[model samples]
Target: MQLTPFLILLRKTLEQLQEKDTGNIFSEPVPLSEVPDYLDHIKKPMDFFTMKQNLEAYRYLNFDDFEEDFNLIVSNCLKYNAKDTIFYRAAVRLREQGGAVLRQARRQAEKM
Candidate 1:
């Protein structure tokens, strides 16, 4: 079945994150080989690709479900990577712009 109108807007919200994540940090799952300690730190690892697939499948029932997962990417990044790291800075921007993107898409979805 096709996604609901609201769900489609949610996908639109994710697009902004796709572009905002410079270097594709949150584009996919964290590589265990690069950073062996990664899995030890963040338990609920999430990324854009997962979110996109989940969203397209109509898995999220409400904004909070989507919001919770979206927030995890930043939380995981900010926690694992130090302030001087690119991942940290990227999360900062993602949280900054991504928050606005979701809210904007949310408002539009509600009106429809």
Candidate 2:
């Protein structure tokens, strides 16, 4: 299974939780029942504005920081032999095209 979709869902879910002012993201594990719905959301394409908003919600100070974190995640995934996981796929996408992706997303958001 591709990890990109799962990673996207996880990121969106975390953002939603934060936006709701939930106490702490780590307070509880994400409900397994909600995974299906999250996966469904991932299947649908998100608009540029939404994508940019989601990226902006991350705590990275800059693209480099984001890249580093993304790389770390990928490395950890590889270390754990979870190369087939959704996280690994998402990490690869981010690692390879994060800057371009962000730039495009920002431009699109600006146009909106």
Candidate 3:
């Protein structure tokens, strides 16, 4: 399935983060070898949907505990050289946006 919607949501969240000056939280580089399992886990379409739902739920709960996961995911994507994929781009944006950005992204995603 296409990851356009998800990327858009992530991009918006990054924008929000930039506005808040919290973008520095995700500045560290993630090694590609570290994310293979995560990328493999989300290889299926259903996995993506499940992740989306979980992200939305996390937002509802005002959770801000996905920093490590986000960093790893984004770093792995970057290391894999998959810049052409929405998932990769979204990961990059999310990394730059920091930990709390997903909640805002989920809120915007719900409007779609």
lDDT tens string, model 2, 70-111?
A: 334334433433578755564455445544544543353334
lDDT tens digits, residue span 36-89, model 1: 999898999999899988998878867788889999999999999999998899
Per-prediction TM-score, please?
A: 0.89, 0.28, 0.29
Give the Cα lDDT of each candidate: 0.85, 0.41, 0.47
The TM-score obtained by model 1 is 0.89
What candidate 3 gets wrong by more than 4 Å, as runs, is 1-66, 99-112
Provide the lowest-lDDT 10-residue window in model 3.
43-52
lDDT, candidate 1, equals 0.85
**Which pairs clash in model 3?**
none
How many backbone clashes can be found in candidate 3? 0
lDDT of 3 at 103: 57
Q: How far does residue 23 in candidate 3 sit from its true spot (Å)?
A: 20
Best by TM-score: 1
- Provide the lowest-lDDT 10-residue window in model 2: 21-30
